[PDB]
Each structure stands twice: as C-alpha cells, then as structure tokens.
Amino acid sequence: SHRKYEAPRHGHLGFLPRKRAASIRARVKAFPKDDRSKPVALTSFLGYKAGMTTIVRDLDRPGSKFHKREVVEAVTVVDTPPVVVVGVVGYVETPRGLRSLTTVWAEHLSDEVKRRFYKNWYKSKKKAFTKYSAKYAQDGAGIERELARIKKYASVVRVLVHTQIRKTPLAQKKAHLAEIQLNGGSISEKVDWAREHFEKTVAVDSVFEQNEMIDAIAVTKGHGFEGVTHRWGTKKLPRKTHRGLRKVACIGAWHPAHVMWSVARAGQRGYHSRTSINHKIYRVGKGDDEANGATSFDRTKKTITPMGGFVHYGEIKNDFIMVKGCIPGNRKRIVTLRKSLYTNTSRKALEEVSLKWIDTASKFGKGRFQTPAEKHAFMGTLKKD
C-alpha cells in the first residue's frame, strides 16, 4: 500500500556511485567553447589549497538592506606558483570521438617532471627522455615534422604543463602534470604559441583577473566507510530499536524480489570528484610583493600569511588566488581552477569588489593580534626579551 505520508527522497542520484576517485587529481571533463577571433590563452590553471580566512568589504547592491554597508565574508586562498610548459598535443575529430594524434615534448625536462614517471626514483638510472632528446641534437627535422602534422590535421590543441612543487612548503617533490586546452587563434597559431613557450613559465595573472567567476575542480576530503545515517542523511530510528538504530528500517518491498539501486546503503564517504561553479575572485596575489595582505584602507605592511602560518600548510611565498566562499578539497590538495563555461550576468557577477581589510590573526587558536608589532604594542615588554 502507499506510504502514509510523502517526503522528498534522501540524497542525489546524479552523483552515483559514491566510490573513491580514480586519481587524487580531479579530471577536467569540459573546457570553454573556443572563440577563434581572440588571442591564444590558457583555459585553466593548477594550484594547491592553503587555507581559509576572513575579509571585510563594502556591498555594492542597490535595493538591498546592506547596500553601501560593510559585510564580513569567508574566502579561500589557493597557492599558485607559475606552471611550466613542457609539451603539446593534437586531437582529431572521429566518428568515435576525439583521438590524440601526436605528442611533442620539450628538449629539456627538470627533475620535478621526471619524478612523475618513476615509482622508485632513487634507484632508477634516470633514463627517461634520454633518447627523445636526441631528436633535438640534429637540425630538428624530427621535431618539426611532428609539429607540421599537428598543424595539418589537429582540430583541438592542448599543452602539457606541470607545477613547480619545490616552491611550495609541501614535501612531495614530485610535480603534477596535466593537459590544458588552448582557446583563441587558429590551429597554426596555437601550435606556434606552444612551441615558443617550451621550458617557459606562465603566471596565474595572465590567465585570471579580478572579479572573475571561476570553477573549482578537486577531490573531496575522504572519510572511509560510513553508515547510512551520515552518508545519506536518513532519519535515526527510535531509542527502543533492537539490533541498532543508525540504519534504514525497510530496504525494499517483497516485489521486485531484489534490493534496488535507489536504496541508501553503507559505504565509502568522501574522496569523490566534484566540480563547483561560480566562485568570484577577490584578489590575484603577487609572491614578490610585500604587503600582500594589505588593502587601500588598512595600509599596514603585512603578507597574506597569518601569524604562525597556515595550519598544516605553512607560508605563502608565491602568487595566490583569493576565492570567495569555500572550495571542494582539503588543504595541501592539488586543485584545478577553470574559467566559466558561459557568460554570467546575474548582477552577482560584474560587481566590482574592493577589499577593506584582510584577517591575518592566528588560525591555531583564538588569535587576537594581526601582526607581531600589534602584540608588542598591546602587551609591552616581557621577561623573554
């Protein structure tokens, strides 16, 4: 018979299965539509999530109660040192989908990228790309031959880039290699752009700008095996329940004589691929610029790193991106930032954001001081000094 009362279903059936992601680096399954009448540029960037903090700004929103008044918002900081271009790839349209035709690599590769090709780097002879480098030892006819093939046949061009993991406070020492699609210009222009940027660095400010909506792609934090109560949010059973109460009481009717796929079950929680869209950039930070955490109103000389450093991450010594709100993934995890797939004009975008203050108090406790100078001025001299 029909259920006594109606209620919405628990959970979303479009995020199935709730299994572990294949790789710790989330895949980019879509790129913005190419506009050939624009200069060649990257469509995404790679970075590492450092932590969160707080900012204060004025609200520019006519018709709102808090119009022209200060608001407090949470932001996420992503450490983004420049990436290095080390190759290009051409794709050909086929009735069976896109197919990669040829890959061309740069003449010299640093040990960061080479570590990605080894599981036992300390024991290896480090022979990777030794014979391939000989293709450059000649005039370069072999390299030029493959570049002409990409120009002649390919319809989609992507560049192989890797992060400079040594510039972060992480201990991995092995770089992350990924493909980024090039938008703008003809196929020949894309190949020429990739060729000139071999062994060069591309900075994050050349990809993104201020007040721009971007998408974050990452793997969420893992929690292992989880019961149905927290994995799916089902109602807890009464206290009187025998054999346990953090369960689903009825998992199916007599017919069909099977457990259905749409019934909540215990299993892995977390470590899934997610794509979150419409995150506004609040600041594009400069690594070599002192007073990263300074605004036109605060005027104090302080970097973006809070006192004591970001918890479990460290200090920010490179360029960074400040993103409004929260982002999937935990600290120290590699994340991919991608441009939007459509032109958003909901007046939530197109708003000019000007920060007034950036919080730099310690996140390791109930921090009270923004800078060491403030602590000394408030407390005076101590026995230690």
Binding site: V56, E70, V72, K356, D359, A361, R368, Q370
Partner: protein, 61 residues
C-alpha cells in the same frame, strides 16, 4: 571597519570575532572569545582575574 573592546578583559575585538550580549536592562556587552563570556556568566569580577586589563591597571603592572 571598527575595532571593539572586550567588556570583561579589555581585549580588542576585530570584525567577526566573539559574541555580543544584550542584557534585560538594554546594556550591551562584547566578548572577544568564549573564555571571557563564560567568566562573565559565572559572575566573576574582572578586577580579580590576573590577566585582564582592569587587573593590571588596578595593580599598576
């Protein structure tokens, strides 16, 4: 922005930090953290708590 002062300890309160309490007599109290708020609720005298600004002023520290 504007920096507030803790009503119990005299510590500076930056935006978003602590809680604000309104008493029955419409008097506003501000606390930088839950430590001073808890001590305020326990009817503790700030002048007898050694690490407060009021204590240091009273004893000329």
């Amino acid at each position: 922005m504007k920096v507030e002062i803790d009503s119990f300890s005299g510590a500076k309160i930056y935006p978003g930090r602590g809680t604000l309490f309104v008493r029955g007599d419409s008097k506003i109290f501000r606390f930088q953290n839950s430590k001073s708020a808890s001590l305020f609720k326990q009817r503790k005298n700030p002048r007898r708590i050694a690490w407060t600004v009021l204590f240091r002023k009273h004893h000329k520290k």
